[PDB]
Amino acid sequence: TGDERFYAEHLMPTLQGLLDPESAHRLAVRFTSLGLLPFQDSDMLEVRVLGHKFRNPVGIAAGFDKHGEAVDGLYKMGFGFVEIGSVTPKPQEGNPRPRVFRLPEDQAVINRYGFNSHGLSVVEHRLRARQQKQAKLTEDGLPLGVNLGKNKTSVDAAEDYAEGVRVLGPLADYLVVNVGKAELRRLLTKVLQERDGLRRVHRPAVLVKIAPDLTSQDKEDIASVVKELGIDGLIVTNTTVSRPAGLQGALRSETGGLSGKPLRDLSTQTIREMYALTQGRVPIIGVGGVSSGQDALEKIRAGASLVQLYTALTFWGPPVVGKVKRELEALLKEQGFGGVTDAIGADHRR
């Protein structure tokens, strides 16, 4: 479309030339929350997973709406599901600024926000203000996830996550915990017990979100514990602390997590491995460097039932959401799939 080209070639490069990345993100949150925003979802794109219907498989990844300020605007942008957070138990400021950096030559970002969070109570009251509106959205195929963090100074990480389950679990369709083997088992056992203690109408799925930076041994151990405990899904992946050869941006050596195109295929290969190690029985939300329908379908074919993006929104703006969905629909037809569902995991059946 013309909007896609105008955002990508003119408006976004101009905003990014005028505004540092944190200011630009804050402006994005404000515009989105007001619905100040520039594709028809077809039956082909619907996915049923995690106990819910998803009208389309393209979600906004954690971190864009850390405090739950823009959920309704994010649905208006075209996302099939929204994940807010990470939310920590107590409010905390996060790292000193600047704490996020653009790598324009790489179509990448590095960030070290450090879990800046309004905290559980503020977010709880924010979501309560729209709780029934969300119930209707979810029923109509637009679910809500809540990503749970821990405070920097916490001495008992499992208890921080347990608090998040109790406070925000009743308002979410799924919860996310970001992640020796016995220590992971202890943590997830406690999270699942707290989840099971909520009333059935307020009882969310629980997913584990992993980094792309894990050893083979770590991945094997996670797959084992996830299957043993009955964890509902995996989110694959967070940003990378690696720095692939070939980054050109002047800021490539800043501390933090790298996202965007240089992360893309590390993430896809991590999806592929986790799908295999769980025998395709554990739903995966695939995330990392998704900017096109091809990127989305590669992750779906590798094992993802849903995908998310963030960094592509920061470079290309709101039209990228409809772009990904249109390209994904077109590729699915070209490859002979009846819908997203038939493509999930398809590379493993070659």
Ligand X SMILES: Cn1nc(O)c(C(=O)Nc2c(F)c(F)c(-c3ccccc3)c(F)c2F)n1
Q: Where are the alpha helices (DSSP H) in 199-292?
A: 216-229, 264-277
For residues 205 and 173, give the distance between their C-alpha atoms in angstroms, rounded to a whole number: 6
Q: Decide which of Cl ion, ligand ORO, ligand FMN, none touches 112; Cβ closer than 5 to 8 Å per partner kind.
A: ligand ORO
Q: Decide which of Cl ion, ligand FMN, ligand ORO, none touches 102; Cβ closer than 5 to 8 Å per partner kind.
A: Cl ion
Does the protein bind ligand ORO through residue 67 (CB under 6 A)? no
65 is in an annotated binding site: yes
Breakpoints of the chain, after residues (C–N > 2.5 Å): 38, 179
63 is in an annotated binding site: yes
Instruction: Give me 135's structure tokens.
Output: 């119930």
Does the protein bind ligand X through residue 92 (CB under 6 A)? no
Are 184 and 191 within 8 A, CB to CB? no
Instruction: Give me 183's structure tokens.
Output: 């220590």
194-253: which residues touch ligand ORO (CB under 6 A)?
238-239
Considering the complex, state which of residue 97 and residue 186 has its C-beta at the smaller distance from Cl ion: 97
Nearest to 45 by CA among 53, 30, 56: 56
Are 298 and 307 within 8 A, CB to CB? no
Does the protein bind ligand X through residue 318 (CB under 6 A)? yes
Question: In angstroms, how far is CA 216 from the centroid of its own chain?
Answer: 23
Q: Would you tell me which residues interact with ligand FMN (CB under 6 A)?
A: 61-63, 66, 85-86, 100, 109, 111, 113, 147, 178, 209, 238-239, 259-260, 263, 287-290, 309-312
Q: Decide which of Cl ion, ligand X, ligand FMN, none touches 31; Cβ closer than 5 to 8 Å per partner kind.
A: ligand X
For residues 249 and 299, give the distance between their C-alpha atoms in angstroms, rounded to a whole number: 26
Q: Decide which of ligand ORO, Cl ion, ligand X, none touches 314; Cβ closer than 5 to 8 Å per partner kind.
A: ligand X
Considering the complex, state which of residue 15 and residue 135 has its C-beta at the smaller distance from ligand X: 15
Q: Decide which of ligand X, ligand ORO, ligand FMN, none touches 114; Cβ closer than 5 to 8 Å per partner kind.
A: ligand ORO
Dihedral angle of Cα 52, 58, 59, 61, to the nearest 10 degrees: 130
Omega of the bond leading into 21 within 30 degrees of 0 (cis): no
Does the protein bind ligand ORO through residue 111 (CB under 6 A)? yes
- Binding residues for ligand X, rule: CB under 6 A, are 15-16, 21, 24-25, 27-28, 31-32, 36-37, 100, 102, 109, 313-314, 317-318
